Amino acid sequence: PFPWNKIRLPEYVIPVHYDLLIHANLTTLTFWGTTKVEITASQPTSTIILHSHHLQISRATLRKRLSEEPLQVLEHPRQEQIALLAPEPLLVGLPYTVVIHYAGNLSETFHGFYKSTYRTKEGELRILASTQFEPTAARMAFPCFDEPAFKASFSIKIRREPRHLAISNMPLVKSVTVAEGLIEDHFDVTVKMSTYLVAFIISDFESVSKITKSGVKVSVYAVPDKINQADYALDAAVTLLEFYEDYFSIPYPLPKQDLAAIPDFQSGAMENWGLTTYRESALLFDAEKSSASSKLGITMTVAHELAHQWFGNLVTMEWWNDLWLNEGFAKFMEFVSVSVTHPELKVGDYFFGKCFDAMEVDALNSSHPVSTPVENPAQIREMFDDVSYDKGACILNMLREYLSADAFKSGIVQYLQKHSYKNTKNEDLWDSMASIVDVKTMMNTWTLQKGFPLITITVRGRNVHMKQEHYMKGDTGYLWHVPLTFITSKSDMVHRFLLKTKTDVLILPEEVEWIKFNVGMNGYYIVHYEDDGWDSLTGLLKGTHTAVSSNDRASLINNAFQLVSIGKLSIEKALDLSLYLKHETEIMPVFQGLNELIPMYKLMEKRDMNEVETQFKAFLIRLLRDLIDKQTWTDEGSVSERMLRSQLLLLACVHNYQPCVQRAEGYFRKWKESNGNLSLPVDVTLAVFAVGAQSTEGWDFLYSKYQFSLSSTEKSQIEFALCRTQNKEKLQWLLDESFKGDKIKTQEFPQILTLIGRNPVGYPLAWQFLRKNWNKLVQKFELGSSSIAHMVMGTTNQFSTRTRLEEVKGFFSSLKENGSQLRCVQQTIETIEENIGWMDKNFDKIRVWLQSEKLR
Ligand SMILES: *[C@@H]1O[C@H](CO)[C@@H](O[C@@H]2O[C@H](CO)[C@@H](O)[C@H](O)[C@H]2NC(C)=O)[C@H](O)[C@H]1NC(C)=O
Ligand SMILES: *[C@@H]1O[C@H](CO)[C@@H](O[C@@H]2O[C@H](CO)[C@@H](O)[C@H](O)[C@H]2NC(C)=O)[C@H](O)[C@H]1NC(C)=O
Numbered sequence: 001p002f003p004w005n006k007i008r009l010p011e012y013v014i015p016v017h018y019d020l021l022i023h024a025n026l027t028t029l030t031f032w033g034t035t036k037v038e039i040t041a042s043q044p045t046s047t048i049i050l051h052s053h054h055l056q057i058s059r060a061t062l063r064k065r066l067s068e069e070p071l072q073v074l075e076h077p078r079q080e081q082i083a084l085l086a087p088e089p090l091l092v093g094l095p096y097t098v099v100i101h102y103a104g105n106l107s108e109t110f111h112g113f114y115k116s117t118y119r120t121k122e123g124e125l126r127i128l129a130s131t132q133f134e135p136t137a138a139r140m141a142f143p144c145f146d147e148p149a150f151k152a153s154f155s156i157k158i159r160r161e162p163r164h165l166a167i168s169n170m171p172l173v174k175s176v177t178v179a180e181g182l183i184e185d186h187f188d189v190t191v192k193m194s195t196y197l198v199a200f201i202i203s204d205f206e207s208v209s210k211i212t213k214s215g216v217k218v219s220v221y222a223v224p225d226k227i228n229q230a231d232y233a234l235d236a237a238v239t240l241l242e243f244y245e246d247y248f249s250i251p252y253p254l255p256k257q258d259l260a261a262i263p264d265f266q267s268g269a270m271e272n273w274g275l276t277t278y279r280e281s282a283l284l285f286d287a288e289k290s291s292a293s294s295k296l297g298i299t300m301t302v303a304h305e306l307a308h309q310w311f312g313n314l315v316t317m318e319w320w321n322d323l324w325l326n327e328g329f330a331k332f333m334e335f336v337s338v339s340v341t342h343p344e345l346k347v348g349d350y351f352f353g354k355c356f357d358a359m360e361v362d363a364l365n366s367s368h369p370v371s372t373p374v375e376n377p378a379q380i381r382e383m384f385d386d387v388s389y390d391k392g393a394c395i396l397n398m399l400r401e402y403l404s405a406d407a408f409k410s411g412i413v414q415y416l417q418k419h420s421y422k423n424t425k426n427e428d429l430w431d432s433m434a435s436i437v438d439v440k441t442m443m444n445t446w447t448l449q450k451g452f453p454l455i456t457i458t459v460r461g462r463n464v465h466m467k468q469e470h471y472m473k474g475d476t477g478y479l480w481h482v483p484l485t486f487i488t489s490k491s492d493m494v495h496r497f498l499l500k501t502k503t504d505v506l507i508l509p510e511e512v513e514w515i516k517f518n519v520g521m522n523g524y525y526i527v528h529y530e531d532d533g534w535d536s537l538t539g540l541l542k543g544t545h546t547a548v549s550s551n552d553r554a555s556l557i558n559n560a561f562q563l564v565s566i567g568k569l570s571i572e573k574a575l576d577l578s579l580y581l582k583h584e585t586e587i588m589p590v591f592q593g594l595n596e597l598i599p600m601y602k603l604m605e606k607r608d609m610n611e612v613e614t615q616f617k618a619f620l621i622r623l624l625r626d627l628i629d630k631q632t633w634t635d636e637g638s639v640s641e642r643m644l645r646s647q648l649l650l651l652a653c654v655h656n657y658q659p660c661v662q663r664a665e666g667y668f669r670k671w672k673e674s675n676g677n678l679s680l681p682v683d684v685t686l687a688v689f690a691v692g693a694q695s696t697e698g699w700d701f702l703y704s705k706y707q708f709s710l711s712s713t714e715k716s717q718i719e720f721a722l723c724r725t726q727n728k729e730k731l732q733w734l735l736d737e738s739f740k741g742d743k744i745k746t747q748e749f750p751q752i753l754t755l756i757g758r759n760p761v762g763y764p765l766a767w768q769f770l771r772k773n774w775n776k777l778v779q780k781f782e783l784g785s786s787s788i789a790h791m792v793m794g795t796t797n798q799f800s801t802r803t804r805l806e807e808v809k810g811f812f813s814s815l816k817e818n819g820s821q822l823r824c825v826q827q828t829i830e831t832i833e834e835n836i837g838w839m840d841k842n843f844d845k846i847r848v849w850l851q852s853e854k855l856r
């Protein structure tokens, strides 16, 4: 008879300090712990509720120069709680200490205190143990008040064999031999922090280190065979840590910061205070083999994790309904920091693309407000999504533009200073921002309702009429305070207008030839132009496209196709606009063009539409052919030029543009004749391998080199190529082997499943594999995880028939408690519903447009 019936812990028993002793055995794969937690009670009680999950509690006692007594233990596994019953009611305000002894098995998933393995370059299997606790898995490693507002200090001790190294949040202060072959490591006490930030790793990692100008020792740890790839991340971390310390004027408060590359890791990285963790591919850099995309990705990932030391660790959201205060800010700070520390990366131009990814899900009924209630672990994991990360960063960027960078920076500094070592709510951020303007009323419209507005512009002479309405595919009365911006043919000053009502008007000083709203796409909204608007802007792009900025051109491309879905613009007119790209040069507008047009043939690929699919792909290649032909088969140029080269050559080869295929075939044959020892330009390797893997001999040869590669980029490039074969038996093998995790690690499975889901002949196999192996995949990755969401959407969200829709509805319906209520399931259902309507309306229009298409 359990005495607590709520998922949320009681509020009146509060921890102050934890002493954690962990003794793990990396041979038996078990661990023992003793947890002592200093607590004080706000009000008298005789029961203490806390979290524990899959931990066998052997004994629990309560300690008051005096006194100690036993506690009865009850468990409620579904609430993931245990209850400790005291003989006497606890006394208010007096310090107690709860001592719990327990045992567990190392987790075989990617969360909790889990097993990771790797093979030495000689073939020896090695075992390590690592942690991943965010959001609710600390309770799988020690019993705790496992909610992020129950902050405390942590003194961690690790018992281990002499052959192993242990690291944790804080520096090692002492090692004591306790028994024959057993050493006890004492780490220094942490600052006050949430339980999800606790971390420890038992490994044989090696490290390299560098000291910041502020005296912080920064280290990168990795397996011995890969530590020579740590130099780039080490240098970036020192630079970025120094940047944030100087930017926030709040020092990093710990003596050291570690970045650890874990051989098995579910996400990309995690911000544990003093001991940040990473997938090997997100941290390690090979100067000969790593891609430009990889260098960018490592830099931004490190910038994200180090931003979290302030936005997340120092200041933490009070509850997961406001996770965006962690994740939106860390995502935004990636661009603030890296635009200064690595200007050659030009990260600023990539930002708006995240906003368009957020708008993809946020246009659906099944989106949710940035701030929204959650209760159980699955729901909490679902908050780590494009709304929290990307919409969060996008509305912060919009607010920064509205307030000015200086007022925004003063706001976030006051916010961080005032709430240091505490927790914040949505409202606390607005109050800090206003202390520098009714920010609260405005930002409440952007955080407490889902979606975004369509802004409709109607011009009569000098009179510019504006209307807002909720953009939904494909009428709730939603209203926003929208900080509009515009430029005109007569003024490229960024003009501002705060639209607070359904309609409003502004008067231009003189008539203009065109007007363009949402300058640089810094606003989280889309724009429709009535009357001759889209013709006028289409003419601008086709005549003098440089009359507006690259990012303004990308915004026009994106918005035109979004307006097709709600019937405000014909597919023919949006496709007509896209034709200006034949004269475009810039990565962002070209990338945006690809990102609007590729998804159209991805729908056709899953239909009996080979004729139009082939003509559409030939149109795409012809549209970009001049740019394709100018690409050199080298690694020259900027990061943007290199990413553009790699993507264009891949596109051209996969769609059988013969000049590219023939050159890629030659490089692959030479690479194979060299026994895989030939150094190819990294930027052409995706295309070369993707062509090579189309034959059985080439696929088999590529796979044979995957075993021995120490390069994350090369393994990623091989994986992509292997997933592109039309040989169904090979596709099935990849699914089976990465599912098993021996020949290909299970951390790659979600990406392999999705790539095969996008394969024009493999997509039935991937959806089938997901259905057949659902229960084991959920057990490995967890309901609500981003990984499960990626697998659900990546195998299903390009279907466009009523028969496929019912397959999806019927399958997930049948799962009941094991998945039927997933948000990603409702999102993919609504996406397929929109695909059905969009294809039913537009397919014949596209077919005719392509035939008429003599412009090319
Ligand atoms: C760790 O795994 C072992 C599996 O061997 C679990 O031990 C079994 O538990 C059941 C039920 O309690 C017993 O009937 C078996 O006899 C146990 N097996 C052995 C070999 O002793 C153990 O419960 C797991 N630990 C936790 C904390 O879940
Ligand atoms: C993990 O367990 C193994 C065995 O269960 C421990 O290995 C023993 O270590 C002692 C002293 O080092 C040796 O005398 C025994 O011969 C070992 N037994 C075996 C089967 O190898 C190991 O020390 C444990 N490690 C930890 C960290 O607890």
Ligand SMILES: *[C@@H]1O[C@H](CO)[C@@H](O)[C@H](O)[C@H]1NC(C)=O
Residues within 6 Å of the ligand: 365
């Ligand atoms: C959106 O979902 C809600 C509840 O799920 C429903 O009441 C509403 O009708 C939906 N909107 C549309 C356009 O289907």
Ligand SMILES: *[C@@H]1O[C@H](CO)[C@@H](O)[C@H](O)[C@H]1NC(C)=O
Residues within 6 Å of the ligand: 676, 677, 678, 679
């Ligand atoms: C080719 O093999 C040599 C000898 O083992 C090695 O040193 C070199 O790095 C290899 N080159 C590539 C591109 O793999």
Ligand code: NA
Residues within 6 Å of the ligand: 053, 054, 055, 104, 105, 112, 139, 140, 141
């Ligand atoms: Na556990």
Ligand code: NA
Residues within 6 Å of the ligand: 445, 446, 447, 448, 449, 450, 451, 452
């Ligand atoms: Na909103």
Ligand code: NA
Residues within 6 Å of the ligand: 362, 367, 368, 369, 370, 387, 391, 449, 450, 451
């Ligand atoms: Na939203």
Ligand code: NA
Residues within 6 Å of the ligand: 564, 569, 570, 571, 572, 841, 842, 845
């Ligand atoms: Na249309």
Ligand SMILES: [Zn+2]
Residues within 6 Å of the ligand: 304, 308, 326, 327, 330, 331
């Ligand atoms: Zn984050």
